[PDB]
Design a protein around this ligand. Structure first.
Ligand SMILES: CCn1c(=O)c(C)nc2cc(C(=O)N[C@@H](C)c3cnn(C)c3C)ccc21
Length: 113
């Protein structure tokens, strides 16, 4: 199959590209429960890009689909929690669109290895 090191290099680059699409950095860190005290009542598995970076370096993404699954959680959690008329909801829609294109290109690179 493929070697670990180039795959992790690719995931690192892809994660950076996804964060670049989050210009407000609203997905960069876990949603602050100090300010959203009911968040865990609705969201079973919080996700954010800092947690994704920790998972990456902890060797918890060994295939592309697990990495993409956690990105999709960032999006879906935000769509679930926030009303449609909020900036947060619309930011998740835009991230789904822009991040999907980043991910399709990165997957093509993974399939080259
Ligand atoms: C879009 C994801 N997201 C949500 O889905 C919901 C429901 N709330 C969010 C709230 C913040 C947030 O509070 N950011 C800044 C003002 C702040 C204030 N104090 N602290 C410690 C921080 C980080 C960020 C993202 C959020």
């Amino acid at each position: 199959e493929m070697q670990l090191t180039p795959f992790l290099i690719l995931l690192r680059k892809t994660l950076e590209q996804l964060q670049e699409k989050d210009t407000g950095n609203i997905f960069s860190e876990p949603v602050p429960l100090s300010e959203v005290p009911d968040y865990l009542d609705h969201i079973k598995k919080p996700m954010d890009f800092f947690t994704m970076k920790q998972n990456l370096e902890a060797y918890r993404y060994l295939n592309f689909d697990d990495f993409e699954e956690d990105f999709n959680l960032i999006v879906s959690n935000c769509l679930k929690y926030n009303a449609k008329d909020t900036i947060f909801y619309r930011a998740a829609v835009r991230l789904r669109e822009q991040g999907g294109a980043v991910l399709r290109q990165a997957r093509r690179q993974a399939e080259k290895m």
